[PDB]
Amino acid sequence: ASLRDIKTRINATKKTSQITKAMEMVSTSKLNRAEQNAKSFVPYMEKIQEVVANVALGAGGASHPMLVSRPVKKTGYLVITSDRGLAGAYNSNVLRLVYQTIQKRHASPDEYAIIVIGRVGLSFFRKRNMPVILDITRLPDQPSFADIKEIARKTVGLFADGTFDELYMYYNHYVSAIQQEVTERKLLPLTDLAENKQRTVYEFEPSQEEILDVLLPQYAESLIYGA
Amino acid sequence: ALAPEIVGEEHYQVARKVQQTLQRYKELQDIIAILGMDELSDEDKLVVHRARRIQFFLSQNFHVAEQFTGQPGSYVPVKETVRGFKEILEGKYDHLPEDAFRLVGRIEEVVEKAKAMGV
Amino acid sequence: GGSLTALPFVETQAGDISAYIPTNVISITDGQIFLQSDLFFSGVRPAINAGLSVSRVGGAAQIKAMKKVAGTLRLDLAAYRELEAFAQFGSDLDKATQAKLARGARTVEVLKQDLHQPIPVEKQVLIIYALTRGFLDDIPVEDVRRFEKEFYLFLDQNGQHLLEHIRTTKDLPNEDDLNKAIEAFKKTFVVS
Amino acid sequence: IHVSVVTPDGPVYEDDVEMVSVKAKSGELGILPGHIPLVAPLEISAARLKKIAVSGGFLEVRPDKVTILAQAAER
Numbered sequence: 001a002s003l004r005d006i007k008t009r010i011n012a013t014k015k016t017s018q019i020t021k022a023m024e025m026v027s028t029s030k031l032n033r034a035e036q037n038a039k040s041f042v043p044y045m046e047k048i049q050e051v052v053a054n055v056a057l058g059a060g061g062a063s064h065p066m067l068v069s070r071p072v073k074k075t076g077y078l079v080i081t082s083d084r085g086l087a088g089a090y091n092s093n094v095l096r097l098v099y100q101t102i103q104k105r106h107a108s109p110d111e112y113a114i115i116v117i118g119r120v121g122l123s124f125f126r127k128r129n130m131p132v133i134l135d136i137t138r139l140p141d142q143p144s145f146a147d148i149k150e151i152a153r154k155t156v157g158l159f160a161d162g163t164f165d166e167l168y169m170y171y172n173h174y175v176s177a178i179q180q181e182v183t184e185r186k187l188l189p190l191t192d193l194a195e196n197k198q199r200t201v202y203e204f205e206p207s208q209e210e211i212l213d214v215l216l217p218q219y220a221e222s223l224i225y226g227a
Numbered sequence: 228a229l230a231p232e233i234v235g236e237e238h239y240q241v242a243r244k245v246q247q248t249l250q251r252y253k254e255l256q257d258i259i260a261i262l263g264m265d266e267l268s269d270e271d272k273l274v275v276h277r278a279r280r281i282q283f284f285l286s287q288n289f290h291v292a293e294q295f296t297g298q299p300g301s302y303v304p305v306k307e308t309v310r311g312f313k314e315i316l317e318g319k320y321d322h323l324p325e326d327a328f329r330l331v332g333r334i335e336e337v338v339e340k341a342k343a344m345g346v
Numbered sequence: 347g348g349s350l351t352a353l354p355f356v357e358t359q360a361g362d363i364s365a366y367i368p369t370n371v372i373s374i375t376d377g378q379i380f381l382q383s384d385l386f387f388s389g390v391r392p393a394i395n396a397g398l399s400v401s402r403v404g405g406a407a408q409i410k411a412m413k414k415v416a417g418t419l420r421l422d423l424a425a426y427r428e429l430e431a432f433a434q435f436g437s438d439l440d441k442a443t444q445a446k447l448a449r450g451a452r453t454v455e456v457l458k459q460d461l462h463q464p465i466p467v468e469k470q471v472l473i474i475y476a477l478t479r480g481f482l483d484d485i486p487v488e489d490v491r492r493f494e495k496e497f498y499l500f501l502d503q504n505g506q507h508l509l510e511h512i513r514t515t516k517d518l519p520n521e522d523d524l525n526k527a528i529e530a531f532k533k534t535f536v537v538s
Numbered sequence: 539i540h541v542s543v544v545t546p547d548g549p550v551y552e553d554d555v556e557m558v559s560v561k562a563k564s565g566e567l568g569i570l571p572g573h574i575p576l577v578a579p580l581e582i583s584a585a586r587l588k589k590i591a592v593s594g595g596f597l598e599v600r601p602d603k604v605t606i607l608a609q610a611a612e613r
Binding site (some may be wrong): 023026 | 439
Binding site (some may be wrong): 039041044045047048051055124134144145146200201202203204205210211214215218222225 | 544545546547548549551561562564574575576577578581594596597598599600605607609610
């Protein structure tokens with residue numbers, strides 16, 4: 001109960017408080033920048049979704065391998081995690097969801113496949129003895145399309161090569177600054193596609209089939225980047 | 228009298244391991260207080276998970292305390308205590324709620340109390 | 347009409363002002379000046395701390411020019427003292443964080459001094475006016491001392507009437523003349 | 539008509555021109571104002587409105603305006 005021990009404990013706690021406050025303000029600035037990036041990105045998503053909904057309904061345009069359901073034999077998983085911690089339950093929730101989904105109905109080691117975005121998820125899956133396909137890490141704090149254009153193109157191509165008949169992705173959705181959701185969905189299999197009631201038939205310079213062939217990967221990449 | 232040649236060899240190892248896990252849990256109290264449980268390694272979370280159970284299983288219900296609470300009271304021989312703490316340290320009862328360990332005599336009573344709790 | 351001013355000294359051990367004599371003498375005087383040992387070692391002369399120094403007589407012991415000039419300086423230093431420890435982490439709010447850091451660094455460089463060679467009050471008023479009106483942002487931090495020295499040299503030749511006006515009247519000269527003089531000096535000072 | 543060339547990162551150009559000409563994968567083509575709705579891919583080339591680089595695009599011709607959903611549409 002000496003005064004010196006109490007004084008040194010007070011000093012250490014004060015220094016830790018300084019560290020935490022500094023990190024808090026830096027994170028507020030980064031949140032502002034990330035919101036700017038997302039809101040700047042949205043218009044292209046709006047336009048491409050409108051165009052694809054306009055073209056891919058009626059007047060034929062069916063039987064596309066990217067849009068027709070297929071007997072599933074191998075499944076792939078895409079997860080978006082972080083690189084370092086200091087985030088409360090941001091990584092653990094999504095990793096727990098992925099682990100429980102895999103251990104539910106994915107018994108065969110060759111049945112499933114994983115591709116990660118964050119180093120935390122990669123280390124998690126290494127410790128848990130699962131096989132990965134690709135790993136990208138050290139992504140910047142304000143990433144854009146050119147950062148993992150190649151990774152996304154490789155993913156959509158390997159699905160197009162027939163490796164996985166089903167594709168799934170798991171990530172965190174920003175509801176508010178405090179509330180945070182953990183969401184999941186199929187991406188590439190495209191069992192259900194959206195539609196709009198303002199469609200225009202238009203004309204097809206390369207015909208509908210080739211038009212869809214070139215269009216669909218852009219849709220996949222745009223959805224990935226929105227997530 | 229806590230010597231290997233006086234009480235035995237199993238007893239000594241069990242007691243030393245229990246004390247080691249309690250000390251390790253004691254070392255992590257400040258960082259849990261400030262940061263939280265989300266910034267720990269897997270081994271540290273396992274240490275905390277077993278330490279809370281051990282600390283709750285060190286309690287008991289007494290004969291002379293019946294007029295306060297109501298439970299009749301318990302008596303446990305040495306071998307049963309060593310067996311129970313050996314099972315706890317082995318991760319045999321890691322799925323039960325941490326509250327089922329409070330104020331019981333033996334570990335079979337822990338199992339019964341967890342069963343009556345809906346688990 | 348005579349007077350007598352007193353400046354007692356009290357020395358502390360490890361910066362502990364809770365001791366018997368230090369608390370005895372603090373409660374008798376009209377305010378205190380605090381000197382820190384951290385600032386002395388780094389090379390700040392004098393190592394005065396404005397966060398714990400007070401003067402209960404206040405502005406009644408000041409001239410009109412110093413009163414009109416010192417409030418903005420006090421507010422700027424108070425603002426800078428809070429965020430000084432977080433300069434390692436940039437990428438803060440670009441609006442009013444690094445601007446305040448730059449203003450505070452320029453303030454801290456102005457208040458430095460060397461042994462002996464005191465400064466006349468008109469020169470102090472003019473340099474603090476130049477700092478507070480935004481006339482020093484272009485000049486980098488490493489040249490503030492040389493800028494103020496060459497400004498003092500400049501005023502001795504072509505600023506011979508502003509100083510006389512402050513000495514005779516005790517009020518700072520016209521704003522437009524001051525602005526023109528400071529603008530004229532800046533065109534000659536070559537910045538490295 | 540005025541054109542809007544947009545990359546996924548954000549809008550790139552919103553220049554207004556009297557005549558528009560957009561190269562296609564099948565063959566080069568110009569678009570008359572008040573055109574029929576047309577859909578065509580974009581080959582890797584430099585588009586020339588003539589009153590910018592493109593590698594990966596999608597021509598969405600509509601009479602009201604022409605929008606180029608290009609990717610990496612630098613200048």
